[PDB]
Write a protein that binds this ligand. Structure first.
Ligand SMILES: COc1ccccc1[C@H](NC(C)=O)C(=O)N1CCC[C@H](C(N)=O)C1
Ligand SMILES: [Zn+2]
Length: 139
């Protein structure tokens, strides 16, 4: 679990959005596993606007942060789960690092701010949904 809170927005994994997230929907994209909802309070996070390929992510299944080198956002095949059919997920960045079911929502940050959130994983891999192209989160 986990979310990004920026301005009057909350960014979560679409497959983990709550009834309240859907009732206050701003934007969602099943192909990216993202959903943004509106909030009444001002957020705590700021968003990176960069091309960094290294950073640090939070891994809830280890209660620890780990450094990672990650690929550029791209279209990557993701096998079927209880939440989605087998499909291509877009704006996804892969890295080598621990992740297991439950780790979605952990934030990935570089020196410039929030880069994205954990969205996929498996066998020593971790995939992050990028948010750096969502320029409207800042306005
Ligand atoms: C962090 O996720 C994992 C990590 C290691 C192993 C497995 C997983 C997850 N598999 C299960 C069965 O929970 C996983 O990758 N996803 C499930 C939730 C939706 C995700 C998506 N973006 O399509 C895909
Ligand atoms: Zn950066």
């Amino acid at each position: 679990s986990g979310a990004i809170y920026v301005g009057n927005y909350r960014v979560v994994n679409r497959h983990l959005a709550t009834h309240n997230d859907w009732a206050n929907l701003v934007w969602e994209d099943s192909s990216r596993d993202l959903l943004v909802s509106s909030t009444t309070a001002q957020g705590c996070d700021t968003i990176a606007r960069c091309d960094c390929q290294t950073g640090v992510y939070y891994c809830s299944s280890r209660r620890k942060h780990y450094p990672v080198s990650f690929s550029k956002p791209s279209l990557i095949f993701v096998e079927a789960s209880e939440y989605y059919p087998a499909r291509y997920q877009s704006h996804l960045m892969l890295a080598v690092g621990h992740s297991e079911p439950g780790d979605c929502g952990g934030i990935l940050r570089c020196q410039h701010g929030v880069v994205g959130i954990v969205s996929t994983g498996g066998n020593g891999l971790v995939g992050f949904a990028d948010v750096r192209d969502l320029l409207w989160l800042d306005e």
